[PDB]
Symmetry: C3
Subunit: 486 residues, 3 copies
Amino acid sequence: DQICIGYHANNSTEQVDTIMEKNVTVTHAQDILEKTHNGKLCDLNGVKPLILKDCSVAGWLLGNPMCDEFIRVPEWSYIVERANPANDLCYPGSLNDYEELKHMLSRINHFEKIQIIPKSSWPNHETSLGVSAACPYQGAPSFFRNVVWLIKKNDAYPTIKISYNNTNREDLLILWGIHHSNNAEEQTNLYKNPITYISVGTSTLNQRLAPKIATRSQVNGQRGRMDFFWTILKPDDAIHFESNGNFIAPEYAYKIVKKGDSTIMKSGVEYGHCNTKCQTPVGAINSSMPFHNIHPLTIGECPKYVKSNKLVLATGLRNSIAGFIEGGWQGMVDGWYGYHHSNEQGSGYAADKESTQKAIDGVTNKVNSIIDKMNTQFEAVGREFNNLERRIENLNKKMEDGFLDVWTYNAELLVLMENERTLDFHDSNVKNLYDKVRLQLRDNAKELGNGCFEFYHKCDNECMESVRNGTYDYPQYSEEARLKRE
Amino acid sequence: DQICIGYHANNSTEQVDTIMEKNVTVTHAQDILEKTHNGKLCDLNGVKPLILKDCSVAGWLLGNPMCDEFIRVPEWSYIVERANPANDLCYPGSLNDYEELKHMLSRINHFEKIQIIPKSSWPNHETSLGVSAACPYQGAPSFFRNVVWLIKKNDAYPTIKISYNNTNREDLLILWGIHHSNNAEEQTNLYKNPITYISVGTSTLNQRLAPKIATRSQVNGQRGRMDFFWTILKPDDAIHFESNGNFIAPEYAYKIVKKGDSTIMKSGVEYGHCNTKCQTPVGAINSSMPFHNIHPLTIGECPKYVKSNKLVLATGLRNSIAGFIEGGWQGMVDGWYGYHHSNEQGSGYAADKESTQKAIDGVTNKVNSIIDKMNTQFEAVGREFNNLERRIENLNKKMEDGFLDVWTYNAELLVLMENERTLDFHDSNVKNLYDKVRLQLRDNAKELGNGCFEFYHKCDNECMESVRNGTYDYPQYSEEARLKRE
Amino acid sequence: DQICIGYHANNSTEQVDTIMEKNVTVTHAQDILEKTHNGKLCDLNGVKPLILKDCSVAGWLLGNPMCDEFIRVPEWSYIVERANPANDLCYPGSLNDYEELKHMLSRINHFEKIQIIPKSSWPNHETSLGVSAACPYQGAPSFFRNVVWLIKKNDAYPTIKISYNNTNREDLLILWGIHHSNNAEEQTNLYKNPITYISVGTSTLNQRLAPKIATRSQVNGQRGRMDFFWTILKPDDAIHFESNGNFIAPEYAYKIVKKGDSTIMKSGVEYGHCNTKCQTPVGAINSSMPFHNIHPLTIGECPKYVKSNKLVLATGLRNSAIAGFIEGGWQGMVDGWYGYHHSNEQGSGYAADKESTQKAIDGVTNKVNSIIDKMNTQFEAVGREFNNLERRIENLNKKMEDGFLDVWTYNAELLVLMENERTLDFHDSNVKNLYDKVRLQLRDNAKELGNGCFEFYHKCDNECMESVRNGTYDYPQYSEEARLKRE
Ligand SMILES: CC(=O)N[C@@H]1[C@@H](O)[C@H](O[C@@H]2O[C@H](CO[C@]3(C(=O)O)C[C@H](O)[C@@H](NC(C)=O)[C@H]([C@H](O)[C@H](O)CO)O3)[C@H](O)[C@H](O)[C@H]2O)[C@@H](CO)O[C@H]1O
Ligand SMILES: CC(=O)N[C@@H]1[C@@H](O)[C@H](O[C@@H]2O[C@H](CO[C@]3(C(=O)O)C[C@H](O)[C@@H](NC(C)=O)[C@H]([C@H](O)[C@H](O)CO)O3)[C@H](O)[C@H](O)[C@H]2O)[C@@H](CO)O[C@H]1O
Ligand SMILES: CC(=O)N[C@@H]1[C@@H](O)[C@H](O[C@@H]2O[C@H](CO[C@]3(C(=O)O)C[C@H](O)[C@@H](NC(C)=O)[C@H]([C@H](O)[C@H](O)CO)O3)[C@H](O)[C@H](O)[C@H]2O)[C@@H](CO)O[C@H]1O
Ligand SMILES: *[C@@H]1O[C@H](CO)[C@@H](O[C@@H]2O[C@H](CO)[C@@H](O)[C@H](O)[C@H]2NC(C)=O)[C@H](O)[C@H]1NC(C)=O
Ligand SMILES: *[C@@H]1O[C@H](CO)[C@@H](O[C@@H]2O[C@H](CO)[C@@H](O)[C@H](O)[C@H]2NC(C)=O)[C@H](O)[C@H]1NC(C)=O
Ligand SMILES: *[C@@H]1O[C@H](CO)[C@@H](O)[C@H](O)[C@H]1NC(C)=O
Ligand SMILES: *[C@@H]1O[C@H](CO)[C@@H](O)[C@H](O)[C@H]1NC(C)=O
Ligand SMILES: *[C@@H]1O[C@H](CO)[C@@H](O)[C@H](O)[C@H]1NC(C)=O
Ligand SMILES: *[C@@H]1O[C@H](CO)[C@@H](O)[C@H](O)[C@H]1NC(C)=O
Ligand SMILES: *[C@@H]1O[C@H](CO)[C@@H](O)[C@H](O)[C@H]1NC(C)=O
Ligand SMILES: *[C@@H]1O[C@H](CO)[C@@H](O)[C@H](O)[C@H]1NC(C)=O
Ligand SMILES: *[C@@H]1O[C@H](CO)[C@@H](O)[C@H](O)[C@H]1NC(C)=O
Ligand SMILES: *[C@@H]1O[C@H](CO)[C@@H](O)[C@H](O)[C@H]1NC(C)=O
Ligand SMILES: *[C@@H]1O[C@H](CO)[C@@H](O)[C@H](O)[C@H]1NC(C)=O
């Protein structure tokens, strides 16, 4: 008859790393790194995003003749734009403060197009000959649909003086442009005025522009250029226009209410009719883990980006008639620590739930604390800088690289320390049990040194159960042990 | 006759959290988070700040009639400004590079106002008619006090040519402006010349401006605009002015010496006549703790900002005829570890000075190291970007959020781990005392298993003090114990 | 007659600090902080940097007469420039977008100067009178060598129209400028046209300029000013020029290929003819340590910067014939970390245990190597390129750098203290385990003196002592002898 103390073992082949040792096999393990995604675009908090397909923000706003598909978007959460849009500006030119406009238009609560100046408001000017071959429509010359190009009528260009007095209860977005001619003859043929000017004024805007006649290289078969501008009109403000040539008047305006911020995503994947909380250009994430390695650029409440490919926390035991010194028993299934009994009455395994429950609770609490002690907040990441702003881009790159390195180091070191701590805790528990069974039986038996005790006397099944319970009668078998000795 | 080992216990109720269990009860604890402030504005290192009350920087500099009295305060550390100043730019207009001037005027030493161009220097121009109803003073039209508005005299406006040596030994700040008319008739009424220009030139400045005549919405009953500019004059440089209309000439200049930098605070709290080191918009904070959660915006040597509400370190034992594994001893005052003694003379308590002193020193060193290993530097945090610089503001917000998350996570994890270590550090010391006593005792007594030893022989107070001291003579009582063993 | 346990001890005086104790003497220690440099400038990955000596970037590009060092370096890794260059611009003026051009003129794969407009292309204009005393050369007036200052000829200034196709297969860098006069008389004497203009146009450029005539201060004896501009020409684009006065036509153009990105170093150290990997204004760093405290500004893959002065990691034993419970200063053992000292009638000796020593050294080495190796290092170029009117972004950058420095310093110090504390107990645990293993094998044949030794009742000789070290002991063989010895 003998009593031994051992620990649970199984056929698991999972491996973890510690500070001192590498490739240690454990019975159970858990991963805290996210590495999967659905590979589709999904709604952000129930708000459908805006997809511009092959168009661009400038082309969509100005009304490119090949980009009239999008006319109904009451609201959106973020904008998805392809990396190299095809139809951006049919007529060569530029838009002032393009990046700021895109950043402002990222997230819009309400959007509606209205007409502010009917085409009938120009009795003394021609409004039908302003077409170009650089903006074809069904094989015919056309122009932008949201603006009107005015030319001379009856060989005369009377001065223009009109004003608009805002009556809606929301802000308005208004766009206008100026055209640069090629030579004096073309300027005379188009406007009859050798020298022209444009004046725009509001409560806060004071602008004056003049044409720049010169020679330029051909773009899309056209040597002219067009420059556009934009502004925001207050609910009770008014805007005044005045020009005598080279003026592109506005026709439609947008009603905008903004109560948030976002950025623009460059991706080519398709919509998927799904709801998510975190979005990446390659897919969506639906994980509660504190770390991930999918993609740097993310929108929304997302885990943190790290370089490591594996972060495994050890939660089980060290995998491998004897005792705890040799190895772990495979015959026991219930519990982590227990006793293997053996006598003439029978043999079997008995577990100790008192310490197993405490160990399980401790490990679970450690894992839960590590997972849940992390704070996350809404963030938007993107590239919003042009050619002549490289210094700020480099600063942002330094930002992201430093944060990535810090997080990677912290996570790796924390995992490495915690694995060893858990292993040492398990060893401490098993030795605590071994000394708990000790110092109670006294000299009635002898310790073979292999984790087992050989009773000199005879201990019944009830006696062994009482030993497990922690209540043992030493004087009951003291004389039997004494006469048994030698 | 028995000796038992135990530890201190009291009526405390503080609770601390570990990595494995939540709010175990401990006897003593220390907080390392600061959550209190005096709620007043105080001097920074003995330098009084600048309080503008209901004015703005531009209004204070230009001399708004209903805003400023005189300069005062030749030096200051930071500027306190209300969220929405009332008196600012009575005449509608704008100031060029407002944000840069605001940032540069944060911390200034030896700020003094001097007069450079007396009003007697304009004998051929009118100087007593440049007043407007948009800037009333005691019910009468007035204008800015630091600049002069020039009008035509005797239906004429001769060209102006003036230069200024800077004979002072410090840098000089000069401001001037240009006025935009409303129509040709008004321009002729104010100035005889129909076309005007302004030329300003220094060793590093080359500027030429022209007025812009157009129709604008009326603000404060005025449709005109005034744009102002500023520059820094070197100690031995000169500035040349040349104009023939629409010119606002300077009259006063400021002598400025700068060494350092700070930021502008938006707050409404009052002055309190105190000297602090860290300042927040809601009050002033002084402490040695490494963390705080008062306000994100701070100026000076302030602790780090975290989101947590509680951060408590454990510096004591676990609270709850006895023994080690029963609990604590309420009656055992004056010590952490010690011996409970009971002979035929009587019973009482005794403490082990050495182990308690080592434990106290270790805990104190741990706490002091955690507190003092923090590096603090002077910093100024504030919002200094306009409406057309949203991207940089987003970048700054990303900076602040990332740093806050990193600090919060690291602090929480460190607190949990150190609490875990410190909570069970003392158990090893108590175990060491126990088996030291057992090693000296050997088999002269019997272990009851609850933490005491039942003496077979008689041990008087001298023998008991010898046992505590570490001088036990086995052969002296061995024969008596052998006879009593049966 | 007795057997004892102990550990190695020596004559080192290294000191380390733990969380609970300070100034603890240890047998062996290792530092993980780099504090040395060669004090020289070296090549970066085999690419020699560009050293401009006393000439600034603008003067080198425009062709300042006092910068006659026309040495050709087709490819450079970074630019070394003095804090206050002397020869920058002989004629007072400014260069548009100077900072962006300087940033773009970092590491360049290919660079060559070619001629695009010969002087013979101006038959109706004077090209020999464009000299000034502000740009002396051998005691004679001169001008920039890369541009031409056009003056009126035969009291006439015909309008200029010219275009240039880029027939090369690489990007082109072109510079031009405009001159500001002082008064009407000077303008008439120089160009004969009271009103002038300049027009420049490409596929993406549309610029128009007009001279500004005013009175300015005297700098270098000249009251005039000169403003220069630059642009990048695509491999199949063209640029058109048109002006009627105050025009400074380009003569030479730079043919450039750009792949990477770098920054500019401000230092005065000399060249060293070395090939390093990390660069610093005060020298070069060659180490694999994760931390350093040399200089905040670095270029390349460099360790992290901290404000600490000492970072020592404990890897040895607690430095100071009975031991194991009392002072373990067993100076006799010089062949291991843990072992036994034996003594009987035959003799004595300081034996050692190989298994425990191997386990301990492997564990400590693994810890040190893991801490050193788990560093992610990437190429980062750190500099300070911001003008006088951009102080807010500079303050933002300074705040970022300070925050990162504080985080790294605090984390490193706390980690070092915690790891020293953790390491200074594994040896104690091993010694206690060895002492326990020595026990429960002799049982009652020996008396545990408590001092860290066992005294056998029976007679055990060298073979029996070697056996008990080996872990094989015959208790019944000496059981009766221990019985008869027990009184
Ligand atoms: C008055 C006229 O028609 N003159 C003819 C020249 O324009 C023409 O030169 C060719 O012009 C081509 C493009 O001309 C258009 C266009 O962009 O399609 C024609 C449009 O009617 C005109 N629109 C308006 C509202 O005036 C438009 C406009 O003038 C410019 O876009 C101004 O920026 O120009 C094309 O570019 C050819 O490459 C160019 O040679 C010559 C020769 O074809 O004939 C003239 O009769
Ligand atoms: C010089 C004068 O008396 N001009 C008369 C016009 O002012 C007047 O038009 C009315 O002008 C009102 C405001 O005019 C002031 C003002 O701001 O109070 C009058 C000031 O004397 C004048 N100051 C100077 C130095 O010239 C000032 C100035 O002209 C403008 O501010 C320039 O920006 O204007 C108010 O705006 C009324 O709405 C407007 O009708 C006309 C018609 O009565 O008579 C003029 O003689
Ligand atoms: C052409 C000439 O000699 N003109 C004389 C004026 O220059 C002179 O005024 C004095 O000018 C001095 C410098 O004049 C130079 C120079 O910078 O050395 C003379 C150069 O020939 C001339 N170069 C060209 C290509 O025209 C150059 C140029 O005019 C200016 O740099 C334009 O910015 O100027 C010096 O500044 C003296 O302080 C100044 O008084 C007057 C009176 O002496 O006589 C003119 O003949
Ligand atoms: C730690 O103590 C807190 C007491 O503050 C316990 O938290 C409370 O839990 C009850 C129900 O369990 C809630 O109704 C209270 O609102 C909680 N208080 C706070 C301040 O959150 C907590 O349960 C204790 N820890 C554990 C493991 O039970
Ligand atoms: C402003 O005044 C100072 C003081 O008179 C001028 O500096 C002097 O200039 C003359 C001739 O230029 C020299 O001979 C003196 O030696 C200078 N004195 C000092 C103390 O430097 C200065 O030139 C004047 N400013 C301008 C633009 O002329
Ligand atoms: C640890 O295990 C992995 C997986 O098999 C193996 O690639 C690696 O080489 C192992 N480490 C060592 C030191 O052998
Ligand atoms: C815009 O219209 C409202 C409607 O009466 C008017 O009160 C307001 O003054 C108008 N705006 C301006 C600038 O006059
Ligand atoms: C996310 O995953 C959980 C399970 O982890 C699942 O129940 C849920 O449907 C998924 N989607 C959302 C939107 O929560
Ligand atoms: C705890 O005991 C101390 C010791 O006298 C006493 O001063 C204190 O008031 C007690 N606290 C409570 C809550 O009873
Ligand atoms: C901090 O302020 C408190 C006021 O509540 C004061 O008692 C204390 O002395 C101050 N500490 C220092 C170092 O000034
Ligand atoms: C310390 O001991 C080593 C070992 O022999 C010896 O080489 C060295 O000289 C000694 N140093 C001192 C200062 O005693
Ligand atoms: C630790 O040693 C250093 C160097 O000898 C000394 O400067 C310092 O004061 C010592 N610390 C203590 C607490 O004695
Ligand atoms: C440059 O030459 C090529 C050669 O065919 C020609 O196609 C191109 O049009 C030329 N550049 C311009 C601006 O015309
Ligand atoms: C850098 O230092 C290592 C270690 O001493 C050495 O092997 C290597 O040759 C050094 N490299 C250079 C370029 O000096």
